[PDB]
Write a protein that holds these residues in place. Structure first.
Motif, PDB file in Angstrom:
ATOM      1  N   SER E 105       1.759  -2.685   1.549  1.00 20.17           N
ATOM      2  CA  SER E 105       0.339  -2.824   1.415  1.00 20.17           C
ATOM      3  C   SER E 105      -0.392  -1.621   0.774  1.00 20.17           C
ATOM      4  CB  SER E 105      -0.489  -3.648   2.345  1.00 20.17           C
ATOM      5  OG  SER E 105      -1.703  -3.802   2.031  1.00 20.17           O
ATOM      6  N   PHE E 106      -0.282  -0.385   1.679  1.00 21.48           N
ATOM      7  CA  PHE E 106      -0.731   0.685   1.150  1.00 21.48           C
ATOM      8  C   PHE E 106       0.051   1.400   0.310  1.00 21.48           C
ATOM      9  CE2 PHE E 106      -3.669   0.889   5.338  1.00 21.48           C
ATOM     10  CZ  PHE E 106      -4.483   0.042   4.706  1.00 21.48           C
ATOM     11  N   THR E 107       1.390   1.150   0.494  1.00 23.92           N
ATOM     12  CA  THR E 107       2.424   1.629  -0.890  1.00 23.92           C
ATOM     13  C   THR E 107       2.301   0.578  -1.873  1.00 23.92           C
ATOM     14  OG1 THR E 107       3.917   1.722   1.214  1.00 23.92           O
ATOM     15  CG2 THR E 107       4.795   2.443  -0.986  1.00 23.92           C
ATOM     16  N   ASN E 108       2.955   0.870  -2.933  1.00 20.18           N
ATOM     17  CA  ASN E 108       2.774   0.064  -4.251  1.00 20.18           C
ATOM     18  C   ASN E 108       1.301  -0.352  -4.839  1.00 20.18           C
ATOM     19  OD1 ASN E 108       3.675  -1.591  -6.237  1.00 20.18           O
ATOM     20  ND2 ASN E 108       4.598  -3.189  -5.144  1.00 20.18           N
ATOM     21  N   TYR E 109       0.986   0.409  -5.327  1.00 19.33           N
ATOM     22  CA  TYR E 109      -0.366   0.669  -6.031  1.00 19.33           C
ATOM     23  C   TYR E 109      -0.290  -0.269  -7.217  1.00 19.33           C
ATOM     24  CZ  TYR E 109       2.205   3.847  -9.020  1.00 19.33           C
ATOM     25  OH  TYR E 109       3.457   4.519  -9.839  1.00 19.33           O
ATOM     26  N   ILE E 110       0.826  -0.890  -7.642  1.00 17.03           N
ATOM     27  CA  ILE E 110       0.981  -2.147  -8.910  1.00 17.03           C
ATOM     28  C   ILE E 110       0.614  -3.268  -8.075  1.00 17.03           C
ATOM     29  CG2 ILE E 110       2.456  -2.837 -10.644  1.00 17.03           C
ATOM     30  CD1 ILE E 110       3.795  -0.005  -9.967  1.00 17.03           C
ATOM     31  N   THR E 111       0.989  -3.639  -6.969  1.00 16.34           N
ATOM     32  CA  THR E 111       0.829  -4.974  -6.307  1.00 16.34           C
ATOM     33  C   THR E 111      -0.543  -5.415  -6.175  1.00 16.34           C
ATOM     34  OG1 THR E 111       1.838  -6.848  -5.080  1.00 16.34           O
ATOM     35  CG2 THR E 111       1.170  -4.471  -4.139  1.00 16.34           C
ATOM     36  N   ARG E 112      -0.653  -6.727  -5.719  1.00 14.28           N
ATOM     37  CA  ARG E 112      -2.180  -7.105  -5.838  1.00 14.28           C
ATOM     38  C   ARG E 112      -2.763  -6.526  -4.520  1.00 14.28           C
ATOM     39  NH1 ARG E 112      -3.831 -11.539  -8.743  1.00 14.28           N
ATOM     40  NH2 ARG E 112      -1.629 -12.130  -9.347  1.00 14.28           N
ATOM     41  N   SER E 113      -1.906  -6.886  -3.326  1.00 15.15           N
ATOM     42  CA  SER E 113      -2.456  -6.532  -2.057  1.00 15.15           C
ATOM     43  C   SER E 113      -2.672  -4.993  -1.760  1.00 15.15           C
ATOM     44  CB  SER E 113      -1.952  -7.375  -1.086  1.00 15.15           C
ATOM     45  OG  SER E 113      -2.423  -6.885   0.323  1.00 15.15           O
ATOM     46  N   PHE E 114      -2.981  -4.287  -2.623  1.00 14.88           N
ATOM     47  CA  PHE E 114      -3.115  -2.808  -2.586  1.00 14.88           C
ATOM     48  C   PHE E 114      -4.382  -2.364  -2.354  1.00 14.88           C
ATOM     49  CE2 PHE E 114      -3.534   1.595  -4.451  1.00 14.88           C
ATOM     50  CZ  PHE E 114      -2.747   2.066  -3.469  1.00 14.88           C
ATOM     51  N   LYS E 115      -5.121  -1.909  -1.110  1.00 15.29           N
ATOM     52  CA  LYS E 115      -6.384  -1.585  -0.749  1.00 15.29           C
ATOM     53  C   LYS E 115      -6.606  -0.064  -0.982  1.00 15.29           C
ATOM     54  CE  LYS E 115      -7.408  -5.680   0.347  1.00 15.29           C
ATOM     55  NZ  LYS E 115      -6.159  -6.495  -0.006  1.00 15.29           N
ATOM     56  N   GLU E 116      -7.742   0.483  -1.309  1.00 19.57           N
ATOM     57  CA  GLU E 116      -8.206   1.782  -1.471  1.00 19.57           C
ATOM     58  C   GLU E 116      -9.233   1.975  -0.170  1.00 19.57           C
ATOM     59  OE1 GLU E 116      -8.734  -0.052  -4.145  1.00 19.57           O
ATOM     60  OE2 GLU E 116      -7.266   0.321  -5.568  1.00 19.57           O
ATOM     61  N   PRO E 117      -8.779   2.103   1.171  1.00 20.54           N
ATOM     62  CA  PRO E 117      -9.766   2.421   2.033  1.00 20.54           C
ATOM     63  C   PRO E 117     -10.155   3.872   2.145  1.00 20.54           C
ATOM     64  CG  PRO E 117      -7.730   2.066   3.014  1.00 20.54           C
ATOM     65  CD  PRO E 117      -7.646   2.151   1.480  1.00 20.54           C
ATOM     66  N   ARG E 118     -11.636   4.061   2.683  1.00 17.49           N
ATOM     67  CA  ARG E 118     -11.880   5.392   3.082  1.00 17.49           C
ATOM     68  C   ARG E 118     -12.012   5.307   4.754  1.00 17.49           C
ATOM     69  NH1 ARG E 118     -11.009  10.427   2.541  1.00 17.49           N
ATOM     70  NH2 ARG E 118     -10.442   9.785   4.980  1.00 17.49           N
ATOM     71  N   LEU E 119     -12.070   4.217   5.358  1.00 16.05           N
ATOM     72  CA  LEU E 119     -12.056   3.875   6.599  1.00 16.05           C
ATOM     73  C   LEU E 119     -11.635   2.559   7.204  1.00 16.05           C
ATOM     74  CD1 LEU E 119     -13.026   4.791   9.527  1.00 16.05           C
ATOM     75  CD2 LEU E 119     -15.367   4.161   8.685  1.00 16.05           C
ATOM     76  N   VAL E 120     -10.638   2.742   8.256  1.00 14.95           N
ATOM     77  CA  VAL E 120     -10.065   1.368   8.752  1.00 14.95           C
ATOM     78  C   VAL E 120     -10.082   1.341  10.189  1.00 14.95           C
ATOM     79  CG1 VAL E 120      -7.624   0.704   9.071  1.00 14.95           C
ATOM     80  CG2 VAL E 120      -8.295   1.398   6.769  1.00 14.95           C
TER      81      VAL E 120
END
Lengths: 129, 81, 150, 87, 206
Positions: E105-120
């Motif tokens: 999910s945090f890998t693979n910037y191409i796929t749909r379920s890719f998030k860009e978080p600053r805080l988790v």
RNA sequence: GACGUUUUCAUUAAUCAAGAACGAAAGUUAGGGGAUCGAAGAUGAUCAGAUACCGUCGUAGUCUUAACCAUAAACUAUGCCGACUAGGGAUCGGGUGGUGUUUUUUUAAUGACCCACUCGGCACCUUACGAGAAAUCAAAGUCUUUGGGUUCUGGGGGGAGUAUGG
RNA sequence: AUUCCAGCUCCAAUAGCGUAUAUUAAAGUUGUUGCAGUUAAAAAGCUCGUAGUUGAACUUUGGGCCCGGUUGGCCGGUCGGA
């Protein structure tokens, strides 16, 4: 057997620093090790330390700030002339413009550049940073 | 360990941890100054005794030696320190 | 790390920092010295002296409240032992092993257990010839390791 | 660090760990920069003025990741007795 | 910091002690004694809950500093808080995540379920296994919860609680969310209740 | 051997050229039994090399006594004394008793327990910080950021542990 | 047939280019600096042991009086120098 207490020194502080501590309990300890660590505190690679005592060998506690990466004894304690300390620099030191082999000598204990300053050169002890 | 000197720890944490491993050395056992039921004379036997105490008035064997500490014959008055 | 045994061990007699008689024991040095002199003229080995009458009379050790250690005590009395306390009882161990050596001939560990005791007696005889408390003419021998204790 | 007349050398003047006092490199894939905004009277946020922490890689890998940040929140003026100085 | 607006108060200690989180975990890998006080006499650990309150005190400092409410992310693979994050989300502005964490999910910037978080903010950092492991690549802080067998690895905010009973998780979720909305700013105190219940963030039994 | 000890020596110490004990199985001389099977062997096999695995008796040997030998995958494939770190529920050998729970010495006695604590032996598995080429390793670590002490081996494959000599 | 005999044509060094052996270097394949022995050649059967090789911890710190060889320069009275 602890044939060199100075060796079963800082190996203990390798096993503290590489394993990430801020101190270790060194027992035994000698005036060899006491003045060794006074020299290291004078350079400030390690930080503040305290000798605590018993009616046995004795203990030392050190409070550094990380900059001790590696030390080590260079046993056997070779006997070095004036020109030959600079041989021992370029074998086992990071760069020219820092880093200290230190020495025991008939002028006590001081690093190899204070040996160059106060103009002797004596027996090896270790390399410290 | 993070920032505290080891003159300044939680103190009694290593206090029962096998005498010499502590920050300095301090022995485990204790002294007792006790009196027999045969004389009421203070007969100081050591806590971890190895000697079977004949009484100073009687010939009664007022303790039996065991490992760890020894096993006294009952009738010994205790008090503190 | 043991010699001759291959094991680890701690048989403890540890000592805290303070030297003098700390807190509670009310006798003078002369009293405990004359107590140890009473003990010494009983004519036994210093192990047997300590194990009984350090434990039955409130004596702490023979060095803290006393000042003079036991083999120093007996040499000021004329009752100093021949071979002091430990080489004798190691010869006693050799006595026990060598008398069991001819109870039965092929006790093969007894051949191995004599060697360790014999070697430690060689080291003790050599150390007692070092500091010249044993006379350096006599040598330890198995022909004297069973007729010198009992 | 400096040439014949001064003139400091080698762009990317890096930043440092505040737990092991080691260094944090531009390779690193564990170092976290924490922006702790303050509080005050009315106690909300003051967003923008920060107690900036940085956490490198060895602490986060080899149990000792958590307690090493209790000390920094203690000894700056952020939390009270979450970090036993008398440990 | 520790304002006069809020510190340890015995009226939010109504809530935590009403959850019985003196029932911690029962065996402790030894990295986990800044927040225990003792254990009940069969050995279940008692929590210094005022320091657990200080945990949320700095946890909201972490959250309200960002000039991007979209950059707030919460994960909940454990079923209990799977409501709670939505109960957080439209209240706070965090984008919710619950269920199965998609491998890479945090890998693979191409796929749909890719998030860009600053805080988790994580919920169960054992049940969020590859949300602990594979998240510390893109340099993210890990706001976590820590029972006495919970990971001291990869975390920095070890909030002590239990995860046995649906009230504890949504309770500390609500106790942080109230003051996060009050760090963004609606109300003031701690003996003062918020307009909506602490019952709200809890788990139904359908 | 462990453990306890406020008992005694005060460095008596680590390994190890030379030297010396021991030594499986097997084997080696002189005896006891001679029950058990059984390397060799004596028989039946039995059909082409479905494959020759089958089966039956078996001197010695296996068991010991006065002695050798000095060989193993004698291997945990890791010489011996040091330093620290993990992280654990049990083990076993010792030491202790919770206003600690029950048969019953009389709530915790004989014994044994939950919760804790200590040193000894046998182990396990975690993330591997460190390695290794890699299987894997809490040591096959603290070695290019190269030096705690000491002993024996290896230098491409063979030829060959062969010839030769002691 | 880019690798054969030739024709071309080109590539280098240049009054200089090859070849043969020998040594040195790169060769941490001699390793004191500075290797390697779980499986790649290499830890032996395990103790005792002598020569050799090492061997526990302790012995006069802190500070005063000045001398000022050297430097920082607001001094710049010399306009590179005290």
């Amino acid at each position: 057997t602890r044939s060199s207490v100075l060796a079963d020194a800082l190996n203990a502080i390798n096993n503290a620093e590489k394993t990430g501590k801020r101190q270790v309990l060194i027992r035994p300890s000698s005036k060899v090790i006491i003045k060794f660590l006074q020299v290291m505190q004078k350079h400030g690679y390690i930080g503040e330390f305290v000798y605590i005592d018993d009616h046995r060998s004795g203990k030392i506690v050190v409070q550094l700030n990380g900059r001790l990466n590696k030390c080590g004894v260079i046993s056997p304690r070779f006997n070095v002339k004036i020109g030959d300390i600079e041989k021992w620099t370029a074998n086992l030191l990071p760069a020219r413009q820092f880093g200290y082999v230190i020495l025991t000598t008939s002028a006590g204990i001081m690093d190899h550049e204070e040996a160059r300053r106060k103009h002797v050169s004596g027996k090896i002890l270790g390399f410290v940073y | 360990v993070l920032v505290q000197d080891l003159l300044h720890p939680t103190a009694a944490s290593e206090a029962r941890k096998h005498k010499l491993k502590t920050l300095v050395q301090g022995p485990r056992s204790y002294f007792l100054d006790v009196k027999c039921p045969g004389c009421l004379n203070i007969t100081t036997v050591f806590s971890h005794a190895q000697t079977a105490v004949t009484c100073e008035s009687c010939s009664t064997i007022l303790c039996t030696p065991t490992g760890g500490k020894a096993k006294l014959s009952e009738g010994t008055s205790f008090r503190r320190k | 790390g043991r010699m001759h045994s291959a094991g680890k061990g701690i048989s403890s007699s540890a000592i805290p920092y303070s030297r003098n008689a700390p807190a509670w024991f009310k006798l003078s040095s002369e009293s405990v010295i004359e107590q140890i002199v009473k003990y010494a003229r009983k004519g036994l080995t210093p192990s047997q002296i300590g194990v009984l009458l350090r434990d039955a009379h409130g004596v702490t050790q023979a060095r803290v409240i006393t000042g003079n250690k036991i083999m120093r005590i007996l040499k000021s009395n004329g009752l100093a032992p021949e071979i002091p306390e430990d080489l004798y009882y190691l010869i006693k161990k050799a006595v026990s092993v060598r008398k069991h050596l001819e109870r039965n001939r092929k006790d093969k560990d007894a051949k191995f257990r004599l060697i360790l005791i014999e070697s430690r007696i060689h080291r003790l005889a050599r150390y007692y010839r070092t500091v010249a408390v044993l006379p350096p003419n006599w040598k330890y021998e198995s022909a004297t390791a069973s007729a010198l204790v009992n | 660090m400096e040439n014949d007349k001064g003139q400091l050398v080698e762009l990317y003047v890096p930043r440092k760990c505040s737990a092991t006092n080691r260094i944090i490199k531009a390779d690193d894939h564990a170092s976290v920069q924490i922006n702790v905004a303050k509080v005050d009277e009315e106690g909300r946020a003051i967003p923008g003025e920060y107690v900036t922490y940085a956490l490198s890689g060895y602490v986060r890998s080899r149990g000792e990741s958590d307690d090493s940040l209790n000390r920094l929140a203690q000894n700056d003026g952020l939390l009270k007795n979450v970090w036993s100085y008398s440990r | 910091s520790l304002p006069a607006t809020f510190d340890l108060t015995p009226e939010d200690a109504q809530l935590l002690l009403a959850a019985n989180t003196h029932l911690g975990a029962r065996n402790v890998q030894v990295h986990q004694e800044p927040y225990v006080f003792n254990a009940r006499p069969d050995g279940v650990h008692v929590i210094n809950v005022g320091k657990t309150w200080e945990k949320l005190v700095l946890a909201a400092r972490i959250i309200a500093a960002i000039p991007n409410p979209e950059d707030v992310v919460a994960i909940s693979s454990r079923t209990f808080g799977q409501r709670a994050v939505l109960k957080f989300a439209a209240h706070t502005g965090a984008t919710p995540i619950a269920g199965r964490f998609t491998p890479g999910s945090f890998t693979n910037y191409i796929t749909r379920s890719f998030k860009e978080p600053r805080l988790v903010i994580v919920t169960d950092p054992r049940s969020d296994a590859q949300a602990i492991k594979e998240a510390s690549y893109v340099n993210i802080p890990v706001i976590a919860l820590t029972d006495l067998d919970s990971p001291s690895e990869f975390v920095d905010v070890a909030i002590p609680c239990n995860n046995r009973g649906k009230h504890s998780i949504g309770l500390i979720w609500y106790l942080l969310a109230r003051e996060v909305l009050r760090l963004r700013g609606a109300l003031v105190d701690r003996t003062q209740p918020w307009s909506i219940m602490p019952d709200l963030y809890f788990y139904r039994f359908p």
